[PDB]
Amino acid sequence: GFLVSFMVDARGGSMRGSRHNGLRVVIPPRTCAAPTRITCRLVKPQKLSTPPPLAEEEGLASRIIALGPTGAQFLSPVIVEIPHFASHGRGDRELVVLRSENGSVWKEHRSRYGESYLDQILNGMDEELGSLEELEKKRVCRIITTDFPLYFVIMSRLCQDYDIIGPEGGSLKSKLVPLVQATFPENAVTKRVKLALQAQPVPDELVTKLLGNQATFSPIVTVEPRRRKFHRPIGLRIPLPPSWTDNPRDSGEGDTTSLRLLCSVIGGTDQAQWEDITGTTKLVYANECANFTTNVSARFWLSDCPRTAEAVNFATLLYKEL
């Protein structure tokens, strides 16, 4: 029941499973000291004595794989690519590699030299590794590891990142988008709380496919958790939609401005109900960003949308596909 079974030595080697399973195992030169039979099999989740203990918004995004020989240790990282079947894209959820040493406990797989070192990990091997963008389009996950645990599986979960802000105030930055920032003044919160500033980039290819050149968008910025009220206004900084940074079609001051500020206050994983709030708040333009305040946590999204009455319809159509 092996998807792949091949001999490998110090020269390295690679193998792909059938097109029906999409597995790719890459063993670079100098990682395997002696001739070794590399294998991979699929594992039925219902056959596990202790399956991954999934929380409410967690799910398995790939098949469970058992790479052989179990317990194999490599001199430097090896690469395993597998397709995922996650039911979402970018947003409130992320994909994480889980591993289990003996089938009893499941933890996040740690890789010290990962995606930032693909070319170095290859050790001169003549193999092509696609970028994270290309893997995203193809719905493929890449596991970089120096050993084979009993099991690997991809899990889908709510983003785990957060920072802590108390009554002294502070600032939050996005992990993905550098200019995305939230400023919490003193007394905005009454105690030390966990907060996250989520910024989801919007790919031009998707916007073009769905809306042509009718609108452009900023990244979607969400102050997490949603459904929270602050005791003082919170400062938010969002990079402008790309067509607006290039050349604004108007001052961005009037209510008929083509630069629309959209807001969604509803709770729920990857749920939004967009409302055009342009003109309800003062926007200050500086450093190729819009700067404004909010008294509540919510999702925020800017759009340079000349057909202004269609901004919510365009946002809704696009958000469904993100």
UniProtKB/Swiss-Prot annotation:
How is it modified post-translationally? Regulated by phosphorylation. Palmitoylated.
Highest taxon, organism lineage: Eukaryota
Q: Which residues carry this modification: Phosphothreonine?
A: T50
Tissue specificity field = Isoform Mu17, isoform Mu18, isoform Mu19 and isoform Mu20 are expressed in skeletal muscle. Isoform Br21 is expressed in brain.
Residues where Phosphoserine is found: S171
Q: In this protein, which residues make up the domain named ZU5?
A: 2-157, 159-305
Q: Which residues carry this modification: Phosphotyrosine?
A: Y162
Q: What is known of its domains?
A: The 55 kDa regulatory domain is involved in regulating binding of SPTB/spectrin (beta chain) and SLC4A1/erythrocyte membrane protein band 3. The ANK repeat region forms a spiral around a large central cavity and is involved in binding of ion transporters. Adopts a T-shaped arrangement, in the ankyrin-1 complex, in which ANK 1-5 repeats are orthogonal to ANK 6-24 repeats, with the peptide binding groove of ANK 1-5 repeats oriented toward the membrane. The rearrangement of the ANK 1-5 repeats orients the canonical protein binding groove to directly face the membrane, to interact the membrane-embedded targets RHCE and AQP1.
Pathological condition linked to this protein in its record: Spherocytosis 1: A form of spherocytosis, a hematologic disorder leading to chronic hemolytic anemia and characterized by numerous abnormally shaped erythrocytes which are generally spheroidal. SPH1 is characterized by severe hemolytic anemia. Inheritance can be autosomal dominant or autosomal recessive. Patients with homozygous mutations have a more severe disorder.
Q: Outline what the protein does.
A: Component of the ankyrin-1 complex, a multiprotein complex involved in the stability and shape of the erythrocyte membrane. Attaches integral membrane proteins to cytoskeletal elements; binds to the erythrocyte membrane protein band 4.2, to Na-K ATPase, to the lymphocyte membrane protein GP85, and to the cytoskeletal proteins fodrin, tubulin, vimentin and desmin. Erythrocyte ankyrins also link spectrin (beta chain) to the cytoplasmic domain of the erythrocytes anion exchange protein; they retain most or all of these binding functions.
Quaternary structure, from the entry: Component of the ankyrin-1 complex in the erythrocyte, composed of ANK1, RHCE, RHAG, SLC4A1, EPB42, GYPA, GYPB and AQP1. Interacts with a number of integral membrane proteins and cytoskeletal proteins. Interacts (via N-terminus) with SPTB/spectrin (beta chain). Also interacts with TTN/titin. Isoform Mu17 interacts with OBSCN isoform 3/obscurin. Interacts with HIF1AN. Interacts (via ANK 1-5 repeats) with RHCE; this interaction mediates the primary membrane attachment site for ANK1. Interacts (via ANK 1-2 repeats) with AQP1 (via the N-terminal). Interacts (via ANK 1-13 repeats) with EPB42.
Protein name listed in UniProt = Ankyrin-1
The part of the entire sequence present here spans 912 to 1233 of 1881
